[PDB]
């Protein structure tokens, strides 16, 4: 499917057996989710954003189904204002960013 | 031009007679550029992101050329770590997310 940007590009995701809404975010290198129950060990890490930084829990090799497409990768969990799906997962479901043309 | 996401989706922009690099950002409602010299009046405003909020200058009806495509809209200027092109301008250049 193709998605226009007149509205936030939100998708439904299924992770850790739970269903959530998340933003397809081409501006994020990483995937960051609001605090939630994940299973396993994790490592501490710091990530920055427009207002500064936040500390998050880093989980590796997490399976996530993004709008019906499966992907496995790193998922960060922390005080982000919104669930964001970053490039580390966007590449796995083949998202491309197209625009304009002429040629 | 189709763009894959294995690397950051950076583009060259021209605004206020100056050339800059900026990130195409589907996760941003607004366009936010690092402190730069723009002409005209503005309004103080605050916006948030991961990490909290920052205060910015809100410039209206700014002409920007993004990768060779013209658009006019609101441009915020402030302490952002990277120049970001948000949806307010992405729609104007027919930007689509496909997968």
């Amino acid at each position: 499917p193709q998605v226009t940007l007149w509205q936030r590009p939100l998708v439904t995701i299924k992770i850790g057996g739970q269903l959530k809404e998340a933003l397809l975010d081409t501006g994020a290198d990483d995937t960051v989710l609001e605090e939630m129950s994940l299973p396993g060990r994790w490592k501490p890490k710091m990530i920055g954003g427009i207002g500064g930084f936040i500390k998050v829990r880093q989980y590796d090799q997490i399976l996530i189904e993004i709008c019906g497409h499966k992907a496995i990768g790193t998922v960060l969990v922390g005080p982000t204002p919104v669930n964001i799906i970053g490039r580390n997962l966007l590449t796995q479901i083949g998202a491309t960013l197209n625009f304009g043309g002429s040629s | 031009p189709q763009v894959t996401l294995w690397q950051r989706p950076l583009v060259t922009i021209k605004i206020g007679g100056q050339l800059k690099e900026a990130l195409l950002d589907t996760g941003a409602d607004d366009t936010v550029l690092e402190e730069m010299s723009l002409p005209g009046r503005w309004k103080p405003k605050m916006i948030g992101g991961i990490g909290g909020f920052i205060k910015v200058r809100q410039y209206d009806q700014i002409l920007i050329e993004i990768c060779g495509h013209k658009a006019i809209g609101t441009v915020l200027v402030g302490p952002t770590p990277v120049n970001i092109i948000g949806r307010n301008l992405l729609t104007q250049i027919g930007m689509t997310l496909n997968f």
Partner: peptide, 6 residues
Amino acid sequence: ETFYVD
């Protein structure tokens, strides 16, 4: 709300 991350 303006969301890139690094």
